């Protein structure tokens, strides 16, 4: 009666190592498998499968893979140890608008030349956020000098978030939930098997989620525990909100040789006048979008509840502002103009710019972002929010972020990895 079958369509939850595939990058370059131009997807009829986006180890793998790629891409670049010197700084005062008063420092210093016998007197411009006043009222040091070594990113490697596809190894499969209005947990019908994930762009940001995927029909609210104020709420929009950012300053770049084969890229004089970096969000669009978000929050908090939006709480710049990398430069924008309302042209968000960047939440590994010549203009899609609930007739929501896993969890929520188990036995009516 026992009959053995091999090739049985059975699987179990499993954790494995997925590989990257893709169609001068920081991330996926040549250490990545070329994609299949005609990838497959198979609908599974009558299959109900339980998904849990909050326990999805694909998120942990992506987090680890992008950090490791980031570091490998800085390892061979120029060390800026020679730059951690006493700086003599004054204010940049030439044609400065009020918003930029005190933002730029004109600093001179004694730098190493190619020969070990000689030094050179050089100068460069720094942002106020890059330096620390010491002592002699003009003496400054770079901010990272008492904490860490700093390296210069190689100005040939772009930070463009080129999409990565994750693919399963043989013996494993990735299941995709196609059930619209899937909130991240529990069972869903309409499951399909895919060879690989769609391309996911490793966009790094806080508060606002940029350039991601959109909800198919309705704005969705997803959380690990909606009643736990210690958990974040991810909000996925069903329409994009366009945001236009810029650094309206025609910068120049100069190369300072600091050794036999090494150079420091310094910000030189700025052409034209000095203006503040900023981002524009269409006001009507933002209001309509916020409209939809509240309508959905009411489903969990009550339709007679007062839902208020407020700006961020205190913390470091990387937490309280909207951080993003665009055009090759790192912007920190003030979002208090977006989250200032009860219930529910353009809105201008002022921004600050930094050159010394501490990625993720690490201490000890700083990088210097070389300046970009000319003027930067960026156009991107806001596709979602990270909100934290501040908490008896009202609830206040504030922008959150800083934990990058939340930005990938929002794209990988539809995927699950399973292991195929091809043997099975069953009673039949035959005998060897």
């Amino acid at each position: 009666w026992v009959t053995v079958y091999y090739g049985v369509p059975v699987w179990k939850d499993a954790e494995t190592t997925l590989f990257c595939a893709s169609d001068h990058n920081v991330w996926a370059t040549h250490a990545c498998v070329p994609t299949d131009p005609n990838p497959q997807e198979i609908h599974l009829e009558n299959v109900t499968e339980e998904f849990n986006m909050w326990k999805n180890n694909m998120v942990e793998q992506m987090h680890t893979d992008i950090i490791s790629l980031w570091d490998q891409s800085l390892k061979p670049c120029v060390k800026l140890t020679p730059l951690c010197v006493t700086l003599q700084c004054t204010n940049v005062t030439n044609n400065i608008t009020d918003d930029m008063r005190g933002e730029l420092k004109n600093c001179s210093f004694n730098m190493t030349t190619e020969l070990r016998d000689k030094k050179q007197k050089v100068y460069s411009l720094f942002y106020r956020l890059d330096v620390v006043q010491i002592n002699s009222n003009k003496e400054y040091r770079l901010i990272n000098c008492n904490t860490s070594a700093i390296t210069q990113a190689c100005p040939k490697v772009s930070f463009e978030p080129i999409p990565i596809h994750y693919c399963a190894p043989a013996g494993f499969a990735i299941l995709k939930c196609k059930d619209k209005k899937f909130n991240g947990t529990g069972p869903c019908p309409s499951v399909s098997t895919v060879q690989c994930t769609h391309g996911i762009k490793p966009v790094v940001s806080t508060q606002l989620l940029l350039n991601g995927s959109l909800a198919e029909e309705e704005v969705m609210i997803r959380s690990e525990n909606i009643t736990n104020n210690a958990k974040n709420i991810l909000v996925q929009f069903n329409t994009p909100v366009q945001i236009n950012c810029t650094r309206p300053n025609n910068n120049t770049r100069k190369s300072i040789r600091i050794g036999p084969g090494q150079a420091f890229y310094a910000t030189g004089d700025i052409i034209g006048d000095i203006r503040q970096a900023h981002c524009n969000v269409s006001k009507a669009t933002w209001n309509e979008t916020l409209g939809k978000v509240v309508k959905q929050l009411r489903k969990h908090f009550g339709n007679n509840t007062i839902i208020r939006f407020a700006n961020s709480s205190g913390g470091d710049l990387e937490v309280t502002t909207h951080s993003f990398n665009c055009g090759g430069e790192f912007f920190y924008c003030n979002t208090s103009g977006l989250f200032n309302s009860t219930w529910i042209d353009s809105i201008t968000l002022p921004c600050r710019i930094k050159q010394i960047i501490n990625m993720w939440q690490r201490i000890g590994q700083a990088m210097y972002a070389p300046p970009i010549q000319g003027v930067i203009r960026c156009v991107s899609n806001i596709t979602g929010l990270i909100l934290t609930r501040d908490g008896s007739t009202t609830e206040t929501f504030r922008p959150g972020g800083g934990d990058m896993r939340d930005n990938w969890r929002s794209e990988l929520y539809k995927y699950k990895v399973v292991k195929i188990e091809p043997l099975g036995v069953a009673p039949t009516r035959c005998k060897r």
Binding site: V2, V4, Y6, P422, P427
Partner: protein
């Protein structure tokens, strides 16, 4: 018709006609190592299943009819329910606790068969 796992929601007797579909899908130094480990594992898992079929006397087959009786205590159901209503995922859950017992019995009946066949030659 159906591709890989397309029969997963089908009944056990509707499935089990697609066995070759699933069988064929089983096949910077740090990235190199991670991928070699994934590939080596896929091979090791494949070979363990093949070794197991071999010791049960089912080498080279997708469907292997054995000489072990079915204990009604493992699953007291008729062929009609098992092959026409149930899917393989449901079945796997139903008899998960008896898998090792069944495997032990399959190995033992093959050892006896293999020896009887030697004595007859």
């Amino acid at each position: 018709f159906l591709g890989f796992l397309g029969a997963a929601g089908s009944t056990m007797g509707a499935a089990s006609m697609t066995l070759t579909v699933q069988a064929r899908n089983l096949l910077l130094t740090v990235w190199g190592i991670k991928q070699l480990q994934a590939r080596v594992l896929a091979v090791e898992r494949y070979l363990r299943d093949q070794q197991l079929l071999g010791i049960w006397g089912c080498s080279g087959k997708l469907i292997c009819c054995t000489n072990v009786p079915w204990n009604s205590s493992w699953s007291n159901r008729n062929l009609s329910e098992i092959w026409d209503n149930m899917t393989w995922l449901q079945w796997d859950k139903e008899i998960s606790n008896y898998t090792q017992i069944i495997y032990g019995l399959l190995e033992e009946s093959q050892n006896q068969q293999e020896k009887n066949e030697q004595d007859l030659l």
